[PDB]
């Protein structure tokens, strides 16, 4: 029943085992920890699939109907300097 999600953060993949009853934001937190991406908090990142669709991070993993392995891209909502 578990889904293996390969989360890619700044080009770096990390494999997160996801429970169907868990919201996607649980995967966001683990992926950012695994890849050591801390400069913006989890709130500031969003998931896109390989077609650029933005995924609802509050939706339970099982409600996406994923294949046994899927790749998702976790990317910043905004980047600002000045």
């Amino acid at each position: 029943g578990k889904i293996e999600i390969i989360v890619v953060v700044n080009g770096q993949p990390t494999q997160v085992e996801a429970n169907p009853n868990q919201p996607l934001h649980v995967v966001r937190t683990k992926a950012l920890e695994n890849t050591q991406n801390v400069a913006q908090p989890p709130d500031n990142w969003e998931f896109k699939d390989e077609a650029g669709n933005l995924l609802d991070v509050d939706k339970k993993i099982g409600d996406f109907g994923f294949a046994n392995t899927v790749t998702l891209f976790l990317s910043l909502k905004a980047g600002v300097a000045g």
Binding site: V8, N10, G11, S75, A78, V80, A81, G82
Partner: protein, 162 residues
């Protein structure tokens, strides 16, 4: 795999310096801050910069100054591109109108988000030649603090190659 936090030496090609400074100076002639990124490949505690990325960016006037914003679509495209190319994001570089430092905005909304990443700030709209002892540089620690890397340490860490 060795984490980016463990990098201690960095090889920076001169051509990658030139593409950063050209962009910063160009938008700086219009009174704008610019942003660039250095990407490359890590080998143990060494990092070889391979390319400069100039991300799509907008220039906005703030209450007290200027900023440069990279939109979400471009940050996603960057993520995919790094993955496709087998590259790693080491550093962001941006310019200030005057004195270089890390502002509260800089501290909060970095693109180079990994522990160990660098953030370099170029003064005076990049009017002067790029110089590792002239920039204000910061490195991200495990508590998400952007700590100063003073000029002496920075010039030891980064060697410009040709």
């Amino acid at each position: 795999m060795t984490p980016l936090e463990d990098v201690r030496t960095v090889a920076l090609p001169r051509d990658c310096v030139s593409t950063v400074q050209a962009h910063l100076r160009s938008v700086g002639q219009q009174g704008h801050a610019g942003m660039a990124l250095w990407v490359g490949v890590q080998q143990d505690q060494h990092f070889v910069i391979a390319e400069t990325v100039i991300p799509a960016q907008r220039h906005i006037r703030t209450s007290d100054g200027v900023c440069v914003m990279v939109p979400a679509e471009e940050l996603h495209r960057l993520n995919v591109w790094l993955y496709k190319r087998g590259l790693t994001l080491l550093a962001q570089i941006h310019s200030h109108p005057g004195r270089a430092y890390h502002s509260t905005t800089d501290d909060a909304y970095a693109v180079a988000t990994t522990i160990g990443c660098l953030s370099l700030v170029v003064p005076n709209f990049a009017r002067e030649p790029f110089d590792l002892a002239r920039v204000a540089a910061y490195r991200l620690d495990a508590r998400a603090n952007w700590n100063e890397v003073p000029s002496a340490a920075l010039t030891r860490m980064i060697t410009i190659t040709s």
